[PDB]
């Protein structure tokens, strides 16, 4: 019913970015989760998918650069950047969205990726 | 266009076991001399003559 | 198996009948009891 | 993949008048998996419609939206000062994911 994004921020190229993306009574663990970004002066492009099942699909350009992580008592999901890069500014919209309707988008934390 | 229409699938499995097979092919028949030494192979057994 | 209707008064007759085959199984199971269904209600 | 020219980039409106907004797909798209959603930057996006058929919530359920093709659209029967965002169209497939860059509605 409420949901915060909270650990982002402003860390070095090349390291490990850590982010949880946190909801309050609504069980999202076995819920479609999407991840999507936004570029300073560019528009929303989604970059990650987790489902309820074993199975991960990723964006055609970053692929194995992103680890994605679900709480299993609390719906919480536990997000890893890996080997940044400074034109990977953008600040990180996290979604339950489903295939009928993909409702109850969040605000997103601002964040910003350089040295 | 394509993308968008009913594509009819068919997946076929098989597995080995102690029981025997079955759809082993329609196999082949000659029936070519009847007087002449030959090879007959007549459902599995080996041999020549007359 | 075999069918003889040779049987007269009574008893398991003198003679000889040997047995054809019918038919073969390709059922691999472990057998190890046996039961008859004499199905008169 | 999926090609989505959404029209106009430039908007002259004023409240409380008839707007037809427009987004072009690809190549013969349906509409039943399409998702029609509203933005406002720097804050929460909201939700339209799911399938352009039956309206989302939030809403006062005025806006015609729907299409076929390559022709999706959405009337809104009366403007309000309130929806001064921008609208974002896109459509599913279950395997493969495209976005669509929204259309700035401003006076």
């Known amino acids: 019913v409420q949901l915060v994004q909270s650990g982002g921020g402003l860390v070095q190229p090349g390291g490990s970015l850590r982010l949880s993306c946190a909801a309050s009574?609504?069980?999202?663990?076995?819920?479609?989760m999407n991840w999507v970004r936004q570029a300073p002066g560019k528009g929303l492009e989604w970059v990650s998918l987790?489902?309820?099942?074993?199975?991960?699909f990723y964006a055609d350009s970053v692929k194995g650069r992103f680890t994605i992580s679900r709480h299993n008592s609390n719906n919480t999901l536990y997000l890893q950047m890996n080997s940044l890069r400074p034109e990977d500014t953008a600040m990180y919209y996290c979604?339950?969205?489903?295939?009928?309707?993909?409702?109850?988008?969040?605000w997103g934390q601002g964040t910003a990726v350089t040295v | 266009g394509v993308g968008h229409q009913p594509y009819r699938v068919v997946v076929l499995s098989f597995e080995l076991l102690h029981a025997p097979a079955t759809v082993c092919g329609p196999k082949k028949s000659t029936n070519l001399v009847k007087n002449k030494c030959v090879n007959f192979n007549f459902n599995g057994l080996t041999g020549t003559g007359v | 198996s075999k069918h003889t209707p040779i049987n007269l008064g009574r008893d398991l007759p003198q003679g000889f009948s040997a047995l054809e085959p019918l038919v073969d199984l390709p059922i691999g199971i472990n057998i190890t009891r046996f039961q008859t269904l004499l199905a008169l209600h | 993949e999926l090609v989505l020219t959404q029209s106009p980039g430039t908007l002259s409106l004023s409240p409380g008048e008839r707007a037809t907004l427009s987004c072009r797909a690809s190549?013969?798209?349906?509409?039943?998996?399409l998702a029609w959603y509203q933005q406002k930057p720097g804050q929460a996006p909201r939700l339209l419609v799911y399938?352009?058929?039956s309206r989302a919530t939030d809403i006062p359920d005025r806006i015609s939206g729907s299409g076929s093709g390559t022709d999706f659209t959405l009337n809104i029967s009366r403007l309000e000062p309130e929806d001064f965002a921008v609208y974002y169209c896109?459509?599913?497939?279950?395997?493969?994911?495209?976005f669509g860059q929204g259309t700035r509605l401003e006076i």
């Open positions: 979604a339950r969205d489903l295939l009928e309707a993909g409702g109850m988008d969040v």
């Open positions: 009574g609504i069980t999202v663990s076995a819920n479609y």
């Open positions: 987790i489902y309820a099942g074993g199975s991960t």
């Open positions: 190549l013969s798209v349906s509409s039943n998996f």
């Open positions: 399938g352009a058929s």
């Open positions: 896109q459509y599913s497939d279950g395997s493969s994911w495209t």
